[PDB]
Amino acid sequence: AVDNKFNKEIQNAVYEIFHLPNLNEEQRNAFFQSLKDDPSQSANLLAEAKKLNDAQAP
Amino acid sequence: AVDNKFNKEFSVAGREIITLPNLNDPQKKAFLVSLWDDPSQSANLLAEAKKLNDAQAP
């Protein structure tokens, strides 16, 4: 029984998501809720966040 | 069993922390880990981060 805490992965995804300047507040809240519920999916969530950030660039 | 909506508080307070220009990279990351781990402490953490930022001003 391996205890995977994902400390590095979570903290990296959080820091990067906060720096994506084109996300809205609702989007950040959705990503953080999904990460808290399933921290194994940090890479999926960060990739999606980056894609939305870029789609919402002025 | 109250849901304290601390996911939304993490999002709002975290953004404020990362927008403090005079904090360094490990300082902002230390604040964010504490916030993620205990979002009930958001106001205390934000206050501490603001005082630290305002004090490290050029």
Author numbering:
A (entry chain A), B (entry chain B): 0 to 57
Give the authors' words:
We adopted the Z domain of staphylococcal protein A and its affibody binder dimer complex as a model system. We next generated libraries at the interface of a weakly associating dimer (Z+ ZSPA-1) with micromolar affinity to determine if we could affinity-mature the interface by coevolution. To clarify these inter-residue co-variations discovered from the sequence data, we determined crystal structures of 10 coevolved pairs that spanned a range of cross-reactivities and orthogonalities (5 from LL1 and 5 from LL2). From the structures, we could verify clear compensatory changes between the residues showing the most significant covariations (13A-9B / 17A-31B) in both LL1 and LL2 library mutants.
The three orthogonal mutants, LL2.c17 (VFLV/IVVY), LL2.c7 (LVLF/FIVK) and LL2.c22 (IVFF/FILV), were selected to compare differences in their affinity and structures. Each Z-A mutant binds to its binding partner with nanomolar affinity (3.98 to 44.2 nM) but has minimal cross-reactivity with other monomers. The backbone structures of the three mutants are relatively similar (Cα r.m.s.d. of Z-A after aligning Z-B ranges from 0.447 Å to 0.641 Å). The other two mutants, LL2.c7 and c22, have clustered pi-pi and pi-cation interactions at the interface (Phe31A, Lys35A, Phe9B, and Trp35B). Additionally, the same compensatory mutations (positions 17A and 31B) as LL1 mutants are also seen from LL2.c7 and c22 mutants. For example, we sampled representatives from the LL2 mutational pathway from the ‘founder’ pair (QFLI/LVIF) to IVFF/FILV. Binding of VFLV/IVVY and LVLF/FIIV are highly enthalpically favored and entropically disfavored, but by the end of the trajectory we see a more moderate enthalpy of binding coupled with a moderately disfavored entropy in IVFF/FILV. For example, A-LILFK has more Z-B binding partners (B=77) than A-LIFFK (B=15) from the LL1 library, and A-LVLF (B=53) and A-VFLV (B=42) are also more cross-reactive than A-IVFF (B=3) from LL2 library sequence data. We do not observe systematic differences in the structural parameters of the interfaces mediating specific (A-LIFFK in LL1 and A-IVFF in LL2) versus cross-reactive (A-LILFK in LL1 and A-VFLV, A-LVLF in LL2) complexes.
